[PDB]
Amino acid sequence: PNIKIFSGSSHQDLSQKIADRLGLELGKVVTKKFSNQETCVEIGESVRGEDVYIVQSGCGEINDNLMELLIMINACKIASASRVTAVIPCFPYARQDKKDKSRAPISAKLVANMLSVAGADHIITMDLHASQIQGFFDIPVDNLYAEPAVLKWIRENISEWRNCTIVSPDAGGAKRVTSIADRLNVDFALIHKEDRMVLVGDVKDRVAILVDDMADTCGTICHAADKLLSAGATRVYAILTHGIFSGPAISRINNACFEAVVVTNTIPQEDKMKHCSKIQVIDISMILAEAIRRTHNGESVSYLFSHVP
Template identity: 80%
Template sequence: MDHNHRRISNENSLLHPDEHYLKKRTDSNSSQASYSLLSPSILEHRPSLTSRMPNIKVFGGSSHPELTKLICARLGLEPGRVITKKFSNRETSIEINESVRGEDVFIVQSGCGEINDNLMELLIMINACKIASASRVTAVIPCFPYARQDRKDKSRAPISAKLVANMLSVAGADHIITMDLHASQIQGFFDIPVDNLFAEPAVIRWISLHIPDFKSAVIVSPDAGGAKRVTSIADRLNIDFALIHKERKRANEIDSMVLVGDVTKRIAILVDDMADTCGTFECASQKLLSAGASKVYAICSHGVFSGPAISRINNSPFEAVVVTNTIPQEENMKNSNKIQVIDVSMMFSEAIRRTHNGESVSYLFTQMPL
């Protein structure tokens, strides 16, 4: 087949100048946000891969079916047919119910919920497609599992992120697409290409659209490790940044916090890659208010929200806690009216389109497609 006919036309690229990419609808009796599946402009401008490109398939695991549907809708595709079952002894069984021979296969599975089961499910799906003669298998992992176990921080500690990388490679993955790895060095654990997308463009867009006086705000990192992230956002918004240095007694327990920077009578926007039990966010918000901040927001890429997280958010002084939908948030939004969600499906769908066409993905590191 002629190479030009095998590529998706750039005329129908997902990129669109519409500033209001986030179609947020707020019920009058609640501040919970809901999102329409697709706006008319997306339906107009999305590429139709089905009619032009028969050799691409997108499958979704059981961790985040809604994100898979959003990605496929933006690409003009139907999700691939796959059945996941559990045997009585809890073993996972996968059935790929359509041919993948010679296909460019993308499997969407996030590291959330029942993480170990979902990881095993992903590995089996990759292997099933590979031995069924798929030409290439790309694992799309919005939230990478075990990413916080990326180094030996004490004697005899495992480097579990490296183990997961090895497992994905052995299963047959040819390429990985993920978002905001806890440590970007995890990419070096792989011998296959890894595209680590950034939520930064989406975060910048949300701040500029939803905080009217953001020019007087301060971007704050809750720890030293996130300094590079917040300085990049602050530079692009042309505003100030601050840093909180924290010392932990043990995992999930904060000993002390020291604020470096001035937040007096200003809006403080905490930015981090992940919110788990929200202990750090809770302590940081109190620190910022005691330092004179007028309002406090929290924004993170991956809203894990385990243990007492929801209770802490509800009892916190945050105006809003904003996360992306790399992890399902429907249940959390029901339990807290402070949680808001940024849809990043357009970033993954555009990354898939560009990967499939052999185009550069680096555009997405700084720009936000519709």
């Protein structure tokens, strides 16, 4: 059983980078739309008794990409692939992980069920919005962390990183920032809204680094950055693993005080970089490639939680 890497249409550059790091050519697949907008998928090579990895992120036209992924999984499964793994760098509907006093769907659970029923045997993803989403599956889920790469970026790009403060934009992400604050041996601050925001932790004359899983409309991080500049911070950075940047995010970032907005490339960023000078990208394709290769060879994946490969 050999590795076969197939790309969905969502993020072809990432799939190519992963394929090069694996020393493979991207599997031959045709993924387009019929005239009536139904997703047309044709696997261009035999996947029999192979270990198939399908790379597709929850970005762009999310429902189209999700249906493409499900259809590709189904095609590979009924084509007698030995094992089918969904490599989903940004998990779609991850923020709909609970109901919370609303007659709402748990869309993340629905997506997990659909992936399972399509025939996925394994999920590889990066920085799930809530790690409880792992429990939405009955198949194994490897939730990788961009932190090795975020810490690397911070050390090699922020000269004052030893005196910086890692800041959570909200009470929800505090855990994450504390983890980072522990690995850098720096202070960590929290910010919560009461339209006013309250900040705990000295940030005067120090570089502040907001950290988060995802920036969609960037209202949260822009408000946090305004508050950080109010409290005497020298420069404010924002580091996010998922740069969705939908709606007015680009205009708000352009009007914000960020020195840089660093995001990983779980979502393609070339178009946003054109219209926003201060967006920067941290490659995490090495982490994804190493996770694929370790799942294939039966080596430890959790080794990657703390080690940059």
